[PDB]
Structure 1
Amino acid sequence: SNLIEVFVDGQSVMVEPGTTVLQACEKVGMQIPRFCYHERLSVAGNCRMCLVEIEKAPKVVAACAMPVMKGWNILTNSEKTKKAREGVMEFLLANHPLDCPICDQGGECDLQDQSMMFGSDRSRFLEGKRAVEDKNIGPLVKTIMTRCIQCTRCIRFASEIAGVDDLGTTGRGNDMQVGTYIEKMFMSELSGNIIDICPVGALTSKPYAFTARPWETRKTESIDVMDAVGSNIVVSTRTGEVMRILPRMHEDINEEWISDKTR
């Protein structure tokens, strides 16, 4: 009817107008790498990890924000696309701290995984790294902002989902910093969710700090009884002990969020 035909590596896919290159690639089972894009949050298009080649075009386009035009062939694995990914990954890891052993995100880190799947295997950064001071925003979220990759997921979550416009970016350029700019606490019934959407260990659960690694936990899908909403959760256990509670997606109940009490 009103669908248009686009090609993903040659294969034809029928998509409705306004679909982005990232969503068109999603129908044929291809997941474009991303750091800043979240389907529950507004499109930011700033990390540039979703750059993908379009056949017969000179410039790679941001897949998360570019709406797909009829007849486009999306080259998700061409050399130009692969070289675009490595360069962006090289820039993300230039100033990133060597905190993987002491970082709670180790083992379940998008920066680690997409580095091993889409980035180079070595560094050519011979300079000194950047360091940032840590911001205290309450007893639930532990901030180590030297690890932040300025993806602005937390800012857009607190503004659009939680309704609290207390997070933002202060500064400019390489010194741009995410935080409150004042000694303020980000306490909300949905605050703990900025931990899950943060790709890196910049925002980590404070109660859960240092206790377990992702690979050694057992995931049990259960339900929440702290309220009558019935949020779907995953209960992480390790050697017969409950380590933490995570959201479990359910479009019709809680999407992918849980309140602080459930968490």
Structure 2
Amino acid sequence: SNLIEVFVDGQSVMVEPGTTVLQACEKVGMQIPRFCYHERLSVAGNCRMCLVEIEKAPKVVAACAMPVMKGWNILTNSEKTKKAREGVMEFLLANHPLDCPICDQGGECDLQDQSMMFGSDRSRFLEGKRAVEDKNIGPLVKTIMTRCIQCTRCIRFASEIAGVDDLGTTGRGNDMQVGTYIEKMFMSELSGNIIDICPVGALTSKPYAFTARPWETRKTESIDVMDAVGSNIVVSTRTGEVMRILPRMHEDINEEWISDKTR
């Protein structure tokens, strides 16, 4: 067995070579915070939320991208890892809009939850925030691009899984904008899964828009019937009425996606 031995917070875990640091911490049940890493998209390494300390090495590494080497001691809860997480969360909330009440992603937002868990509790930002032009990519995805944190799960989805290549980053710097650069309509058969994998409220479900809110939704784990694939879904109801259909993770049918007919 060509497994190599590493350490996660001192605890020895065995990994196949080529294992990322994030997966080495997943193999002891610790989830490193992340925004741009998605386990079915390719690795981008461009939110820097997974910056974790390797001891006897004076620089935090991007755990989503970094393959482990032999004998590392990964420090997920050390001081400079927490300073990295708090600083990166401060830059993510520097120009994010105060839209948490009028946002559908509230209650089921990644940015809110790991701002609460791994971020600070106040702002040092004293300037005016940016504002981004909204886009019309169709009747299914409500686009409010001020909330976008540029994690590029859009482009990796529509370049790898959807195979469409309509999305990209136009511009440069803080004015870089995820979009299509034209009034072009993103209608794939899988086009609604960018509502799933957007960690923020930049891409929301326009039919589900403004109607409900996740903590009061009752989750019911059911099956698709819209085709013969049998996608596993959540039919989430609120007080006796169907609100939306989310996917379930089933590793052998619909890995964590559904078609737009299903959704």
TM-score (norm 1): 1.00
Alignment of 1:139-158 (within 5 A): 139-158=139-158
| Secondary structure at the counterpart of residue 52 of structure 1 | strand
Q: CA deviation at 1:131?
A: 0.1
Q: CA deviation at 1:20?
A: 0.3
CA shift digits 1:128-178 (9 cap, x unpaired): 000011000000000000000000001100000000000000000000000
Q: CA deviation at 1:262?
A: 0.3
| Secondary structure at the counterpart of residue 145 of structure 1 | coil
Match in the other structure for 2:105:
105
CA shift digits 1:197-227 (9 cap, x unpaired): 0000000000000000100000000000000
Match in the other structure for 1:219:
219
Measured in 2, the distance between the counterparts of 1:96 and 1:80 equals 24
Measured in 1, the distance between the counterparts of 2:239 and 2:113 equals 26
Match in the other structure for 1:185:
185
Q: CA deviation at 1:73?
A: 0.1
Q: CA deviation at 1:36?
A: 0.0
Measured in 2, the distance between the counterparts of 1:38 and 1:121 equals 26
| Secondary structure at the counterpart of residue 243 of structure 2 | strand
Number of paired residues? 263
TM-score (norm 2): 1.00
Q: CA deviation at 1:25?
A: 0.1
CA shift digits 1:19-70 (9 cap, x unpaired): 0000000001100000000010000000000000001000000000000001
Measured in 2, the distance between the counterparts of 1:98 and 1:203 equals 16
Match in the other structure for 1:232:
232
Measured in 2, the distance between the counterparts of 1:259 and 1:34 equals 26
Measured in 1, the distance between the counterparts of 2:198 and 2:148 equals 9
CA shift digits 1:76-101 (9 cap, x unpaired): 00001000000000000000000000
Q: CA deviation at 1:14?
A: 0.4
CA shift digits 1:200-255 (9 cap, x unpaired): 00000000000001000000000000000000000000000000000001010010
Q: Cα RMSD between the aligned structures? A: 0.3
Measured in 1, the distance between the counterparts of 2:96 and 2:120 equals 15
- Percent identity for Structure 1 against Structure 2: 100
Q: CA deviation at 1:102?
A: 0.1
Q: CA deviation at 1:187?
A: 0.2
Unpaired segments ≥5 residues, structure 1: none
Measured in 2, the distance between the counterparts of 1:251 and 1:122 equals 40
Q: CA deviation at 1:190?
A: 0.1
Match in the other structure for 1:166:
166
Measured in 2, the distance between the counterparts of 1:120 and 1:220 equals 35
Match in the other structure for 2:23:
23
Measured in 2, the distance between the counterparts of 1:101 and 1:9 equals 38
Match in the other structure for 2:6:
6
Unpaired segments ≥5 residues, structure 2: none
| Secondary structure at the counterpart of residue 71 of structure 2 | coil
Measured in 2, the distance between the counterparts of 1:129 and 1:226 equals 43
| Secondary structure at the counterpart of residue 130 of structure 1 | coil
